[PDB]
Symmetry: C3
Amino acid sequence: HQDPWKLSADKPDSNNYYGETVANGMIGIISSPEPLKVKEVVLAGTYDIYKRGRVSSFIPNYNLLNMKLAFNGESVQTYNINNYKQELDMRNGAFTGSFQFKDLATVTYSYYALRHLPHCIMMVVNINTQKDTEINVENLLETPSSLNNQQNYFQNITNTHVNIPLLTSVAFTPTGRSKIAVSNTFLFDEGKKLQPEILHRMNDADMHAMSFDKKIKAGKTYSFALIGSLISSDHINDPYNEAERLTIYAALEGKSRLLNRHMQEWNSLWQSDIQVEGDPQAQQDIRSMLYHLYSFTRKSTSLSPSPMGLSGLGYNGHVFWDTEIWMFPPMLLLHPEIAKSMIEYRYQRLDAARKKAAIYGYDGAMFPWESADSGAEETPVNALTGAFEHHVTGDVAIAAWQYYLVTGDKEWLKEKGWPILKATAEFWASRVEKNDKGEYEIKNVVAADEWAENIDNNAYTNGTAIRNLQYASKCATVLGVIAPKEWTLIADKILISKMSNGVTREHDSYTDQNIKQADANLLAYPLKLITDKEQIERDLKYYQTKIPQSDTPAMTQAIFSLLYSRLEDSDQAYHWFKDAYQPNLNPPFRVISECKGGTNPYFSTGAGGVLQAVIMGFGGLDIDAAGGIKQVKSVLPKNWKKLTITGIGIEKKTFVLTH
Amino acid sequence: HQDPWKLSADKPDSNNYYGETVANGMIGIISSPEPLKVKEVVLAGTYDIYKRGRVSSFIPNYNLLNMKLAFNGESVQTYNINNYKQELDMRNGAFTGSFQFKDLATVTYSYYALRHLPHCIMMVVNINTQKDTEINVENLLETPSSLNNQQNYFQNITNTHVNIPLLTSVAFTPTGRSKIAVSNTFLFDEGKKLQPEILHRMNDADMHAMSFDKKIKAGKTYSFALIGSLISSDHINDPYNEAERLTIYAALEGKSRLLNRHMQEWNSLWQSDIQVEGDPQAQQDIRSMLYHLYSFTRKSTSLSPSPMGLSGLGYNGHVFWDTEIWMFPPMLLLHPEIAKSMIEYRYQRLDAARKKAAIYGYDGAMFPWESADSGAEETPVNALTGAFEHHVTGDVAIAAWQYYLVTGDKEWLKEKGWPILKATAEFWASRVEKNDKGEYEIKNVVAADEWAENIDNNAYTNGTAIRNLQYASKCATVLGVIAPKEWTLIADKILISKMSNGVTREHDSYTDQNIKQADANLLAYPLKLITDKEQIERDLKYYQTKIPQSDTPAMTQAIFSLLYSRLEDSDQAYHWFKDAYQPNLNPPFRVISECKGGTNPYFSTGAGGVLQAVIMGFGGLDIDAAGGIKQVKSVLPKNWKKLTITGIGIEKKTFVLTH
Amino acid sequence: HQDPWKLSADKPDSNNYYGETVANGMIGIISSPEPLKVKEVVLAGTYDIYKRGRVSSFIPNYNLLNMKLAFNGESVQTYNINNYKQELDMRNGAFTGSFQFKDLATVTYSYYALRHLPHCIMMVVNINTQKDTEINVENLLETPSSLNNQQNYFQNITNTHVNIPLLTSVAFTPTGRSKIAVSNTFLFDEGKKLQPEILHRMNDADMHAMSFDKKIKAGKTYSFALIGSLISSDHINDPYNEAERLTIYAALEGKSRLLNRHMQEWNSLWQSDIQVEGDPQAQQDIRSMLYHLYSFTRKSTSLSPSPMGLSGLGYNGHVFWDTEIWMFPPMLLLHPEIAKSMIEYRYQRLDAARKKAAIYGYDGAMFPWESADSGAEETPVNALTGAFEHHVTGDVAIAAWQYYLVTGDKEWLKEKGWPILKATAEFWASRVEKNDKGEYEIKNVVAADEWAENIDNNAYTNGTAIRNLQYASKCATVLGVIAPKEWTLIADKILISKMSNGVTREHDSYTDQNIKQADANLLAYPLKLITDKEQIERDLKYYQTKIPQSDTPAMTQAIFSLLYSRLEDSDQAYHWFKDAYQPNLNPPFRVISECKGGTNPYFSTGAGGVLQAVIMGFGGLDIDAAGGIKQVKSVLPKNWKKLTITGIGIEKKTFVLTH
Ligand SMILES: OC[C@H]1NC[C@H](O)[C@@H](O)[C@@H]1O
Ligand SMILES: OC[C@H]1NC[C@H](O)[C@@H](O)[C@@H]1O
Ligand SMILES: OC[C@H]1NC[C@H](O)[C@@H](O)[C@@H]1O
């Protein structure tokens, strides 16, 4: 189970199973241990009041692939199959199951969130017989209890050449805020005259189904596909007609064309890859990380990943600095156009940030701690982060400047970067307070160490304000505009203090408290405010043991790894690399939970972190302050013979590292 | 009945009557055979789910002019009047009825969709008595069954000088998507003290009425008017108050001011005119075509005509390439500012085109086959054109470039033309596939010949892609912007094939099939990809026979006419000119149906086609690729002594043609 | 009661009491005569159909400060309190009440609409007992009858450090157009362990309450605060969560930080001030005028004041030319950034003005007589002003040009001023009619003298059209853009006529009618079309006695004052100054009603007028047509020893005047 491209599980154990996800940046499908079922489906961009937090949330959607298969009128179940296996092919996001039913037939089924068609899904089923048998196949559209006011439809779309049977449902999110349409069809190879008649049943309030029978002789392979389109009022004005239209189009494209297009898109994604020689487990793990990031983003959009991407409802689907600081930097280097989507998400919500600033008594743009559809604040009111954790504004500005540094796109800087950088700088200029010594303080925040609440002069926050102001001033110079000279004066005098031992103080109330996650250490990377090697080391020595083993998110150890790599300490770098995700894994596919021993995968934030430890740490790759990508000194784990990183920067460079 | 300015009908035959329309680009009113009634009223820009196609539709609206007239308490009906006549004055869009009631009085009534006031209507009624008589007059607001949740209101708006009685109705389209308000008033000449008291009855769930009596002595003329305002939530935030406000405004402007303004606007429209000497029927017919286009469009808006304009619900009020290719070119030459509205419709829906492209796996902007309020696809799901007829994107780009060529407005090119041209070119670049010989193919479309479904390399479609790409590249050069060099490379290598007989092949599966309408012939005009005269001729010879007499729309013969005019073949040109619309006519006003012997007027697309045959064909007028309007060789029908075309181009030129 | 900074009232008389307002540009709170109650609360930007006019309106909001106080379970009443006093401190918008309960304790309470936090309020309560006693305190959230579908909530927001109890209500405006959320908390000094337990009762459908008891020992002061946040769907997508979030944030900021920020903002506002020596009553009155303007506007927004600011539902909260011509000029001179908000209100509604123009048959932008949320017309239909009072378009243009003149901001001219000026000029170009002598007329308007309805060539209206056209042409020149030369030709020939006595004729039907308010006199100031002193004087002589004593708004005499000051006639200037507001005052705080002896304060329009009489009249300050602020000859009232005006223009100049 250490193929570098495939994750595999034998005989799923439902008592200890955490599904894997396939996704195209719009729809995500999470596996079930049960054959021919899926656990959960999630549509990006669709939010309503639901469960956790009393704020907007992703909504569990139609489990549109659910099928029941019977042989000779005997239902297939986990309990009467054998040789049952599941595999995820990360090369093309194909989830496949396979099993034997008694003495009758082998079943293989593969499903896909099609890469080119954001709202279309497909499952292909093959049955290979060892004896004569008749299958009954049923596709179920059960309206989840998250949705309401459902309607269940069925019709035949025909011409002289086809009969396309459409199983359609339409329903609402809990407050009526979004309308959801799903439309499914079966695709056969045998043509209109010979295809099975499709029956429709509507026996339940919350479920309807289409079904058919097929006699198959011994020694034959019978194939069929299920295509499904899932779309909402958040994506299109008339989701009902659009879903039908999409499934009909996909049906007439046909399995072969769909999968060819799908594969082309995935092949382009994997032109940026990380290859490790001498450690199969590392190789597979890093592939899983890349795969989940690629699955949970989409080029040419305004979508941004939640901390859990499309793996579920984790953190209500909300967007945090988890994007800008954690998932964005690796995507910027490998695929700038994915990064472009992430920052586009922020650019389009600049106006709601302006609104937030005004409501909280400030100038410019104040980005929310948690963001969703509108760009307004979405943090649950019970968390003081919503009101008080303000570094997110600086995080957005850092991302925006980085995007420009890497691409050199001055047109985008003028159209999008500068709006962001200017407004966010204006925020910080209004956020600081000058004291009697002419220093600038940022008081009463929640720190990046979120256990420290309502404290003053948080190191990380104050670091982001410095960068935000500096970068906005540089941006002005690039565009030939005059920037308020206050921005520089403030930046140069924002307080970052040291304790008597010379260690960066986390905040004004800080002595030796345990901390939730990296904060002061973030001034070294990614901010690069602290570049002195002895200072990096002292901060590392002092804080690295301040993060407890339990209930601490995967937003720490990856940075420790990167910083030890930069210091050229292989044993330390490798210790922290492994510690950042290996204690967080869930079976059977080594998905990453938020915390050690956690059970809430997939935490895509953690993946993005570790990916920087690999690319920026072991690879030595770094965003040069004067533009483009550079390489600094680095070390590999002892047991790594070669590290190869492809498709870096706009020149798409390959970096090879050996001992 | 061959006045060059008036269409007239004696004694309307209700068993065989197709009403004429008066319209101001916003409201259309379709005549009834019955006196003092109207058949149908349609409001542009208002769409909701309704009947045909399960998709958005124009909605039958309040027949706000319906009046009942009684003499000595005896209702006027078709059955008790005599000398009944109707006439449409195309000079000012006045529909007039006139009749005699027994021995008592002559009635004349004229109604108008006021040209300056998009939401206001007026009917003027004159009664000339031959004996003493008392009239009872009633104005009815019946809520059509297309609307729901109606409220019926009545009030008196007063000051010391006036009493303006308002009959008001407010209701909803089927799904609640639009709120509709209608407000009517009666205008008298005799002033507040002497005017009839107005009674209000609300006897039915779906109808209320205002009424009055008036004694008139023998030998006197008594005049009154009905003013009506009709508006929706699609046009204004508060339609209820806005309708009342408008009717009060119009009332205090008075009949005389309203008609003077109305006539000024119509006079401006007719400064661009076509005059034919030697054929009264041609003259009247071409006037009707101009009149319908002028009535169904409006300068300084973002409105675009449906194929049936405001003549009714035809094609659900949706916008098709019927605008860009068929109705737009004649309007661009005669009145550029009307063309500007047509393309503005598309510019404002550029975003919904981008959305469609992404949903179907493409870059840039993919315009919908059928468009309505949002700009999203509105083609009924049962018709495969929705998903597969793709030339519409190129049609929109061609229109946009043409607009620039004719006006020379480089500011508009930068602000509106280039956005369109760039996105649409990006679509085609993503739509083509390169083959092993370095040619580019466009596979799996429905052709302009819509009877050819799911075929490859449609001549017309491939023609539009070439033009779209070339024009986008030229546009880039004009604005000094760098365009992807791919656009030219692709354009130059898109496939256009010939069969062994040297005739342009319609598509890759094409041999000798009957075709719905012109396709390959369109490469000659309007695309002008084929300029070789022998090639034009061969394509004409081959395909002209391929269109059946039945169920083929009026989007063919007009092109045949134009192309024979260009070749200087008068007899052929004239045969096809007449064949394009004369077999499609409906009595008593010679309105045009979509197909030969059809019964679904008024097909404004057909009119636009024929108008190009006249202007571009017989007139020889042509949009020069380097800018402005030029004239190429042409011929007139034998029986036409003179053809005069006025107000052409931004220089407003007159073209005179004789044998 | 003539402190120059405080308005004060002893023993409020509920039978003759008009409350004063505290406001921050977003929320207004109007005082009650009763202790620890407020009369009315109004939220800017929230409109729905409600009562007057059948059109959108501000809505009575939660009286969120209402408290009941008891000693030893004996409620505070008028009948058992003594030295009851109220005071408004204009320095910081603090409304304070103070009183004695029997012989046992002194209570003071001060409330604030916090200047930095647009949606937050605070009341601070101090109780000093002279014997041991127990207070019961109750904060009531009664849902006003203006709102519907209310929900009453209560919860505890905690961490180890705090327990923040939230009393929250959510409700809807009459039609469901706006959702309103209010969330209150109590702030204690004594910390989490020792703070009173908070009880919650929900005994009524429309009222719930939080309460607590506290023992206070003899000779001790017990202090607590109430913080309230009031917000709607018009301000934020999720008002319910945002209100809770804001109150939590304010609570953790704490009273002291909030009042510090509050005071900083007020201190900046008062850096522009008017000081009079030798007339305490004048000084206090002019301070009240300034105070009300500062309270009813807000820098860095798109908010514009209604004629009654945030003092209540006066004129349904609608925006009129009352802003551009009456409130805007004094704010432009003193604080340009407040003026910038006023014109931003119009810039953001330019599109709805374009819509209105098209609906009424005109080009460009036609601003509504009455404006609210959308920018569409909101005048009640029963007032002919809505359809016919057209000078508002010119008024908006004049304001826009003035803004540029004073600031010199050419970036804003290009981005915002020119759009407005161009569209509005295009309106007038389409609005005029040329007659036989080559003059231009504007026919069928309601005049600025609104008693003149449906008349032609109103002096004021025609004056605004001249200015609008001239300013748009000048604006074009500044930006190097070509303007239609028709604008100048029209401007130069618009009709302004004189009667035989050489007096400016108000309109074409005008001889000697009484008039509602200044019209022809407005051509002298503000338009400055009439600069000849003898002409000014003759117009003044003829019209000044044409305004009746009764039911004439305060939009006349202040102009008379300014014009007599410009003529150097102190006795006349001073007569008209006092006449403009002194007969309009209401007790106990000298609030200004709309008309003499009126009872509908606070008419902020009137205040703006008088403030121009002071600044532009007595101060001689004037907007120079070539840019910046200048000073012309002027006179002071005899009894004024010195007039000092501070913070004028972008150079923030001080003007000092003596005899
Ligand atoms: O994953 C989202 C969120 N969880 C809590 C963490 O402390 C914070 O750093 C992160 O943004
Ligand atoms: O007129 C609407 C529509 N009808 C069908 C025709 O074939 C097509 O060309 C046209 O666009
Ligand atoms: O104060 C609002 C409105 N009331 C009536 C006045 O006549 C008018 O001039 C003013 O704009």
